[PDB]
Amino acid sequence: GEIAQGLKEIAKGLKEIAYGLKEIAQGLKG
Amino acid sequence: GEIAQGLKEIAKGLKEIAYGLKEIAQGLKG
Amino acid sequence: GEIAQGLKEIAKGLKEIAYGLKEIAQGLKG
Amino acid sequence: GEIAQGLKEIAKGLKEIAYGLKEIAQGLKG
Amino acid sequence: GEIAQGLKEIAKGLKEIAYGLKEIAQGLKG
Amino acid sequence: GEIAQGLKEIAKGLKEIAYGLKEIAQGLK
């Protein structure tokens, strides 16, 4: 139920964090 | 329920973090 | 519940991290 | 309990990331 | 549980990222 | 389950990022 939904939203947030960190690493290369 | 609510609040915090990381990447590229 | 309270405390800390990341982004833009 | 512990460790990692980004931004302005 | 294990693996990865960012900061300052 | 699998895949991606950041750091120093 909403526990599984809460964990799926956490996973989505972590995926978006990962993608921001990728963008940061790209920016630091040039 | 309050476990689900706490998990969704964490997810909200993670998504806010992802927004800040993306903005940092934007700032590195510009 | 103590677990729900702990999860809300985590969420509070994450939101504080988010604000600091937005500060870093603002400083990179000027 | 184990899920909350994982989330607290994630929050610690994100706090460390934010510190490293602030130090990077200072170094890029220097 | 495997969800807690995945969250702890993400925390380890985030801490590794934090160390690389700090090394980048140190390299810009030195 | 699918949540655990997705989290493990995120963790794999974070290791890739860490190793890009290592390359950057060593290129400065």
Residue numbers in the entry:
A (entry chain C), B (entry chain B), C (entry chain A), D (entry chain F), E (entry chain E): 1 to 30
F (entry chain D): 1 to 29
What does the literature reporting this entry say, word for word?
The Gly@g peptide with a = Leu, d = Ile crystallized in two forms. The second crystal form revealed a collapsed C2-symmetric 6-helix bundle. The first challenge is incorporating multistate design into αHBs, i.e. considering multiple conformations and/or assemblies that may become accessible in the CC free-energy landscape.
Expanding this pattern to hpphhph can produce larger α-helical barrels. In peptides with four L/I–K–E–I–A–x–Z repeats, decreasing the size of Z from threonine to serine to alanine to glycine gives progressively larger oligomers.
